[model samples]
Target: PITKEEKQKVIQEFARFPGDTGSTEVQVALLTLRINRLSEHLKVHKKDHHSHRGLLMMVGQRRRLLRYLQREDPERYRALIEKLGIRG
Candidate 1:
């Protein structure tokens, strides 16, 4: 986990286009962070319904991003999948 200050200091670390998280690399990083956030919410609130919905949405968004990356850049798609350890 990156601290807020640390993240600010290294914003360019996550993307080639500085200040633009819309890039696929940055989007993937953001989605991965969101998944961790949702997982944390589920840890103590197992019965939370809305949080679960958010989690599902995040998964779907990540899936679409992965598909787009696959179609646009197969090497990046493979590397991203391997880096994140995400699987069906």
Candidate 2:
């Protein structure tokens, strides 16, 4: 599990501007980190339904945000995906 401090560090890294707590970039980065962690946990605990459900929820939220980003700014969307190392 990621400590709150580390999570805040990630938010700061991807934040587009000062006080950017819920920007698309920040949100996607945070969600990606969470999904990755939960996924790793599931790999070890195969029957962890609770974490699986949370993972699915986060995936959905991340996808929606990514789609919005793509529609609004394709370049930033591409950059974010690449930076996040998601979508291969």
Candidate 3:
């Protein structure tokens, strides 16, 4: 559940790419952030399969994005994972 302000911020950042949506790095970062938030929501509503499906989709998207980042720049990939506190 993205807050109105956060959604606006995302739209603003996404707008800068002019349809490119920046890079895999940006996609992974944003989607991971969203997944983390959705995870919190799911914690309270454990039976919400719809949100769970979304969370799984987000995870897969992040995984693909991270794989791209890893291929493009392994150092940056490592740094991003470190900064984000994510092992994968």
Candidate 4:
């Protein structure tokens, strides 16, 4: 689970503009962080099917957002992928 301060730090880093919380970049970054955390959790607790499902959903959502960002702004999408060290 991401703490509020950690989430805020992600938002601050990924935000497109001041006070921007819901932009595609921010959303995808946040999801990526959550997905990473959940992946770690599942590594230790393999029997947690519920968290596994949530991880799948979060990955799917991030994929959708990344697709949209690539379509809308290829440069930003590329930059974001590089910065986040995620697959494009």
Candidate 5:
């Protein structure tokens, strides 16, 4: 449920460099926002099986990316998790 503007803002906030859109950091951040939004939606609509499935998928993807980041760059992975308040 993140709007274009909101997505763009998150991209800018997490982007490693200007115009960097597909980097691991930005991707994880974007997914986090999306997962959060969908989770809220599912809370209100408990029977939204489809959205719940999508949320699980996104969470899986984020976990994969976080693991990759942790292996590739521990500092960045730690910083990102702390900034996003995830994996606490």
Candidate 6:
């Protein structure tokens, strides 16, 4: 589970402006962090197939958001990718 401090750090890192919590960039960045944590969990519990499916769903959801961001604003998408160190 994501800790409150970790979540707050993500919000602070990616938010475009004060209280801009629900923007596309913030959403994608948060999801990216969640995906990273879930990946680590999977590495430890290799047999957790149920969680594996959920991980795939997260990846798909993040991909969709990234695609939308890319289409809407390529520059923001590029900056987010660079900041997150995520593969496009």
Cα distance off (Å), candidate 2, residue 25: 1.6
Question: Candidate 6: where is the Cα deviation over 4 Å?
Answer: 1-4, 42-54, 62-66
What is the TM-score (0 to 1) of candidate 4?
A: 0.61
Per-residue lDDT tens digits for candidate 3, residues 1-88, read 5477755655355435655445554566577677767758856875646555545766776545556667778776666576443574
Q: Which residue runs of candidate 2 sit more than 4 Å off their true CA positions?
A: 1-4, 7-9, 40-54, 62-65
lDDT tens string, model 4, 1-88? Answer: 5477755567677775676767766777677677778747856774646555545766876656556777788776678787664674
Cα RMSD for candidate 6?
A: 3.5
lDDT of 6: 0.68
Return the TM-score for each candidate structure: 0.57, 0.60, 0.47, 0.61, 0.62, 0.60
Q: How many residue pairs clash in each candidate?
A: 0, 0, 0, 0, 0, 0
Per-residue lDDT of 39 in model 5: 45
Q: How close is candidate 1 to the true structure, as a TM-score?
A: 0.57
Candidate with better lDDT, 3 vs 4: 4
Looking at model 6, residue 42 earns an lDDT score of: 56
Candidate that beats the other on TM-score, 1 or 6, i.e. the better one? 6
Residue lDDT tens for model 6, 10-64: 7687775677767766776667767878858856875546565555655775656
Cα error, candidate 3, residue 37 (Å)? 2.1
lDDT of 1 by residue, 4-39 (tens): 764673346665564565665666766776788776
Candidate 2 residue lDDT tens string, 1-88:
5578854667567775676757766766777767778747856785536555545766776656656777787776677777665577
Which residue pairs in candidate 4 have backbone atoms (N, alpha carbon, C) closer than 3 angstroms, thus clashing?
none
